[PDB]
Amino acid sequence: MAPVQKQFREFHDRIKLAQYDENQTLRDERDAVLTAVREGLKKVFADRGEAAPTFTPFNQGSYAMNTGVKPLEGGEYDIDVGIILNIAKDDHDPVEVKKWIRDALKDYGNGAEIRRSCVTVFKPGYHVDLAVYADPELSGGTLCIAKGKENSGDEHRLWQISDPQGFQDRIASKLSGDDAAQFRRCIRYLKRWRDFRFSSDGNAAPLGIGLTAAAYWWFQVSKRTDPVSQNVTYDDRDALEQFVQTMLDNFHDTWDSKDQRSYPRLTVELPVQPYNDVFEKMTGMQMESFKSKLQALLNALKTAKSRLELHDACKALADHFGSEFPVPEK
Numbered sequence: 001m002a003p004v005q006k007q008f009r010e011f012h013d014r015i016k017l018a019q020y021d022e023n024q025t026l027r028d029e030r031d032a033v034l035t036a037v038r039e040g041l042k043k044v045f046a047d048r049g050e051a052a053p054t055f056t057p058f059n060q061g062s063y064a065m066n067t068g069v070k071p072l073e074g075g076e077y078d079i080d081v082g083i084i085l086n087i088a089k090d091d092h093d094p095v096e097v098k099k100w101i102r103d104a105l106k107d108y109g110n111g112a113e114i115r116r117s118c119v120t121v122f123k124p125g126y127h128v129d130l131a132v133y134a135d136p137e138l139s140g141g142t143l144c145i146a147k148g149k150e151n152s153g154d155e156h157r158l159w160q161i162s163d164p165q166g167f168q169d170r171i172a173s174k175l176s177g178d179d180a181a182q183f184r185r186c187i188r189y190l191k192r193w194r195d196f197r198f199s200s201d202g203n204a205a206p207l208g209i210g211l212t213a214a215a216y217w218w219f220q221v222s223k224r225t226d227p228v229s230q231n232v233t234y235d236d237r238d239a240l241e242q243f244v245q246t247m248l249d250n251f252h253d254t255w256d257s258k259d260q261r262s263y264p265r266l267t268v269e270l271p272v273q274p275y276n277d278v279f280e281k282m283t284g285m286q287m288e289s290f291k292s293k294l295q296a297l298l299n300a301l302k303t304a305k306s307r308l309e310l311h312d313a314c315k316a317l318a319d320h321f322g323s324e325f326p327v328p329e330k
């Protein structure tokens with residue numbers, strides 16, 4: 001077995017959160033919000049003199065893709081869900097449609113909020129992010145998400161071409177079996193690193209979807225086949241070292257005319273529509289901090305390879321991964 005592999009797997013067991021289809025609690029919290037949307041739309045549409053439109057819900061985000069992590073103490077669960085409203089996009093304003101959902105959920109938990117990309121509802125210990133889409137069958141065959149808030153300049157308010165199930169299919173399908181298992185472990189490892197080392201400034205933290213898209217482009221399996229038994233052993237430390245090095249190699253110094261300097265930027269295109277850079281909202285200074293911490297993680301992953309003492313290998317990794325990374329006693 002590869003050095004530190006046991007402690008990586010132990011760390012993975014401690015940080016992993018069971019996906020929607022294996023997590024009753026998450027299914028219930030989701031369905032509660034979906035139910036409240038149905039009840040709430042009735043009242044919103046009583047004032048407009050017709051039945052509320054129906055919607056088809058579908059699972060989104062990490063809890064759909066089986067890349068979910070437990071939040072740190074005092075953090076929140078992030079339940080991502082899509083609702084496809086039975087509406088023609090050309091007949092309605094994206095913000096109008098999100099307002100229906102917001103007003104439907106006004107008196108639910110700690111309230112609700114129109115965001116650029118979703119309506120978020122807040123509960124004690126979690127938020128539900130409802131991505132709101134128009135019916136492709138009434139919108140010319142395209143699935144469009146409702147983008148914009150009231151404060152949006154009307155250029156940032158639109159029905160944008162979207163492919164959440166294509167993205168989810170791409171993450172599911174890149175690899176199979178135990179290869180796909182290591183891919184998913186390495187995404188969870190980076191998400192716990194993110195939560196541990198980007199807690200001072202939440203807005204500077206690399207988005208989950210960015211780390212997931214980065215793994216889609218750049219993750220390579222690391223495993224070894226014993227030449228006698230043909231018995232396959234995974235090397236998560238090496239897989240993470242190669243993946244972190246490849247992310248670092250993809251940073252580009254980017255001129256900023258305001259500050260009259262460059263910042264190192266990592267561009268990560270979504271592999272599906274709308275093919276946007278999911279890191280575009282991260283500032284140059286946030287990107288430089290992201291790069292330095294990624295370099296520090298890369299250095300720790302190399303240190304963990306060379307150490308005489310398993311204690312010293314694990315301790316070097318725990319400094320980047322936090323309190324769930326096992327450190328065997330010297």
Ligand SMILES: O=c1ccn([C@@H]2O[C@H](COP(=O)(O)OP(=O)(O)OP(=O)(O)O)[C@@H](O)[C@H]2O)c(=O)[nH]1
Pocket residue numbers: 060061062063067068069078080081117118129131162163164165167191207208209210212270272273
């Ligand atoms: O193809 C796309 C485009 C965009 N999105 C948008 O990404 C959001 C999920 O983005 P998150 O950052 O929540 O991603 P995640 O769930 O994979 O990661 P963690 O929370 O575990 O950190 C969804 O709420 C949707 O609006 C997709 O899910 N798919």
Ligand SMILES: [Mn+2]
Pocket residue numbers: 061062063078079080208
């Ligand atoms: Mn999420």
Ligand SMILES: [Mn+2]
Pocket residue numbers: 061078079080129
């Ligand atoms: Mn979310």
